[PDB]
């Protein structure tokens, strides 16, 4: 018939360069799942916590490592429903680029467009902005790239960053550590070790999920493979 309810601003400016209600959203991604992203400089590899901690996981396509398109993949930390819309929206955006350019959407561009809805939800009454942060990968310009889009809509540029449990501590360890000039196989080994540092508990292959982006294209690594990398390194 019609709906009203809540249509006045719910968000008030705090002197910090951010609003109060968005700041709270960033704590939400912190209590979210561990996800790590490191740019290997010959592809980008992104790794995420497979589990939602029930430890019955049986993945064959239900992943949180998802190809949007030919060379873009997304792994996230935070909310499930909020993420599904970003994935559906991302394909429409990538393709929007694919129609005009005949190449899909660069990392920078995809970020600008996803970011505008996340802010929209803030300023408006009767909505709340996402609780999701994205680790976005891509191969554009002849270089691998990795961007971080936060639940606010702000963007921070990162060659390596960590999300989930102990995210803050995660960023400083990466800032010092981050590597480049890595072979594909090595890319996986470094990524898994960084995931060990963020994520607690058991890792086997139904606890962590890995996806790689390189020249051939983004794909999502089979549960057998992840296991071989995990064992290999200290």
């Amino acid at each position: 018939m019609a709906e009203r309810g809540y249509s006045f601003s719910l968000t008030t400016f705090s002197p910090s360069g951010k609003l109060v209600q968005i700041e709270y959203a960033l704590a939400a991604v912190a209590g979210g799942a561990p996800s790590v992203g490191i740019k290997a400089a010959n592809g980008v590899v992104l790794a995420t916590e497979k589990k939602q901690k029930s430890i019955l996981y049986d993945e064959r396509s239900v992943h949180k490592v998802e190809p949007i398109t030919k060379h873009i993949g997304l792994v996230y930390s935070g909310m499930g429903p909020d993420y599904r819309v970003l994935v559906h929206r991302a394909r429409k955006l990538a393709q929007q680029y694919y129609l005009v350019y005949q190449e899909p959407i660069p990392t920078a561009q995809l970020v600008q467009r996803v970011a505008s809805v996340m802010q929209e939800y803030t300023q408006s009454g009767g909505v709340r902005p996402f609780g999701v942060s994205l680790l976005i990968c891509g191969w554009n310009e002849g270089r691998p790239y990795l961007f971080q889009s936060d639940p606010s809509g702000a963007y921070f540029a990162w060659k390596a960053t960590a999300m989930g449990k102990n995210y803050v501590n995660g960023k400083t360890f990466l800032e010092k550590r981050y590597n480049e000039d890595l072979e594909l196989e090595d890319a996986i080994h470094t990524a898994i070790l960084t995931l060990k540092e963020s994520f607690e508990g058991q890792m086997t292959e139904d606890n962590i999920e890995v996806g790689i982006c390189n020249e051939a294209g983004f794909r999502r690594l089979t549960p057998t493979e992840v296991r071989d990398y995990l064992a290999a390194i200290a």
Binding site: R4, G5, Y6, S7
Partner: protein
């Protein structure tokens, strides 16, 4: 126009909280005096806030709504600067003025603008998301009869014809200071009207003719905004004169 509370609720006073709050919002658009002559109807505004790294155009309380109607704003208060909320009333007022030029192509009437504005403020009450206004405008302009017009409107929704009116820093107070200065000679002499506007602004502002910018508008010619430099020459003589009437 979307909210989820009423914009105002009535009182047994018979005042509108939002219109009175708006009156202070329009004194943010500082003090403006306008006097009506025989052939040049003149308004002048307080503060240009010159620092010679700025432009003079951007701070204006003088706004051209058409090229033969112009207005300067305020009402009552003493509250802080800000051009902007007043500027918004101008942006509505300028469409309102322009739509009439489409309808009647001769120099459009002052009366039309003031009436539309009173009704415009009541209407905003009705919508829950719309912020009301309550301002005073010094409408200046010419008819198709070629006779001078200076009209003024109030937050009470009421417009009156006048030979001199001032608004700002106490609306009744700047107006009364002009009532003293007025004589019958003043309005026919072209020269005399200009001095009235400058004595009123010179009261609330320090070192005018840098904070006094005034425009004359004419029967045959459109809006002319005078340079400040030629206004300062007047301020020096006129301030001599201002002490005399007091």
């Amino acid at each position: 126009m979307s909210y989820d509370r009423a914009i105002t609720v009535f009182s047994p006073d018979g005042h509108l909280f939002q219109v009175e709050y708006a009156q202070e919002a329009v004194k943010k658009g500082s003090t403006a005096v306008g006097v009506r002559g025989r052939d040049i109807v003149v308004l002048g505004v307080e503060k240009k806030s010159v620092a010679k790294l700025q432009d003079e155009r951007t701070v204006r309380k003088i706004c051209a709504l058409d090229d033969n109607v112009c207005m300067a704003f305020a009402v009552v208060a003493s509250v802080s600067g800000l051009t902007a909320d007043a500027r918004i009333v101008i942006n509505r007022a300028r469409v309102e003025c322009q739509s009439h030029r489409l309808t009647v192509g001769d120099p459009v009437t002052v009366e039309y603008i003031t009436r539309y504005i009173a009704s415009l403020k009541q209407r905003y009450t009705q919508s829950n998301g719309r912020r009301p206004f309550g301002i005073s405008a010094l409408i200046v302009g010419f008819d198709f009869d070629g006779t001078p017009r200076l009209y003024q409107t109030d937050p009470s929704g009421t417009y009156h014809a006048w030979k001199a009116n001032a608004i700002g820093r106490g609306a009744k107070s700047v107006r009364e200071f002009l009532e003293k200065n007025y004589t019958d000679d003043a309005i026919e002499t072209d020269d005399l009207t200009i001095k009235l506007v400058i004595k009123a602004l010179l009261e609330v502002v320090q070192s005018g003719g840098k904070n006094i910018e005034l425009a004359v508008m004419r029967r045959d010619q459109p809006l002319k905004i005078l340079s400040p430099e030629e206004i300062e020459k007047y301020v020096a003589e006129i301030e001599k004169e201002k002490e005399e009437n007091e």
